[PDB]
Design a protein around this ligand. Sequence first.
Ligand SMILES: CC(C)(C)NC(=O)Cc1ccc(Cl)cc1-n1c(C2CCCCC2)nc(-c2nnn[nH]2)c1-c1ccc(F)c(Cl)c1
Length: 94
Amino acid sequence: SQIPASEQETLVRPKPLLLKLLKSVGAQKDTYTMKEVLFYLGQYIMTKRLYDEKQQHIVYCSNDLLGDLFGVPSFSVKEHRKIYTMIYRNLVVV
Ligand SMILES: CC(C)(C)NC(=O)Cc1ccc(Cl)cc1-n1c(C2CCCCC2)nc(-c2nnn[nH]2)c1-c1ccc(F)c(Cl)c1
């Protein structure tokens, strides 16, 4: 993995729009580890069916709050570092 374990364990405070997104899929707190944020975002992607049904490693996030927060219309889920960077746009580290 390109994401160090200590990074996955970092405690963060999502900004209000990301926080709203996480709560929409059952999150209950204001502070999270990065691994929690990522997992809830994955749940969000599945409930909103943002992944391409025929190419399930591609997410199309245009016209969804996620696309606005990430600043891209689409991404490959294999791009782990890019995804972490896009998440960082939307939080403050504890
Ligand atoms: C099913 C549960 C909810 C367990 N998936 C996740 O939490 C994974 C996840 C969460 C958020 C986002 Cl933006 C992408 C992904 N995500 C996905 C998507 C696919 C479409 C449905 C939603 C998940 N696929 C991979 C993957 N596939 N092969 N390699 N990476 C990754 C992923 C994994 C580890 C990583 F550090 C990163 Cl940065 C991203």
